[PDB]
Design a binder for this molecule. Sequence first.
Ligand SMILES: *C(=O)CCCCCCCCCCCCC
Lengths: 215, 40
Amino acid sequence: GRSVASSKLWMLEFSAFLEQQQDPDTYNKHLFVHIGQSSPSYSDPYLAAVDIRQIYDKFPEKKGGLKDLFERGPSNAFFLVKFWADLNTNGSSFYGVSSQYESPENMIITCSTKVCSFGKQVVEKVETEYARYENGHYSYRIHRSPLCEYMINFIHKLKHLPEKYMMNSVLENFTILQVVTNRDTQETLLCIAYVFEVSASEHGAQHHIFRLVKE
Amino acid sequence: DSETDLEALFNAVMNPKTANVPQTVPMRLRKLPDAFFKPP
Ligand SMILES: *C(=O)CCCCCCCCCCCCC
């Protein structure tokens, strides 16, 4: 499906999942959210714009926050992803997140993921990734990164809510900010703001990708 | 109080009479594209 790309980095894949082990040879994987799974990943400027000012309140402020990052640019690195999450699932459980990126450049990259409540940072996960040469480009993979305990707790609490409108109500004040940076130069390669609702549709998880603009 | 209180976040929706969280503008009331609220 539709993915996310600046001039220097393309995120081809992103998925958060629960993997359950029935027995040593049998595993069941449930995808909560996914980009580049059901169909081959592609990227083009054929997607709509969102005024970033409409979402500043939902993400960290001050130096290093979303406004600061956006103003520093480049403008083409900033995206808003709306997820409709599939919550229909559930000792032998593994909650994980996997992502893959491609670049023309051989870099050392840092991926910061901040989980936020009411626009305030709750937890940050920071990962450093080195390049691998692949078919005329450089590939970066964050493979089966364990979901933090806060997120596991959050998912558990969501599923224990008796009504779906309640889940959506909670989700309106839950956000994730992902910032992928060149470690040495501190250039913003990708900055992705994630917003959530619960999926109701029979096919499962869905997403829409928007460009963040100044207006 | 603490804005990042996980229990308080869920209590706000489960037990609205005892809700103690920041007051916010719902997303559906904001200047956002139609595609934001309608899945593909
Ligand atoms: C580290 O723990 C942060 C990894 C990024 C989180 C992936 C998104 C999790 C989506 C799960 C669905 C629950 C939210 C509706």
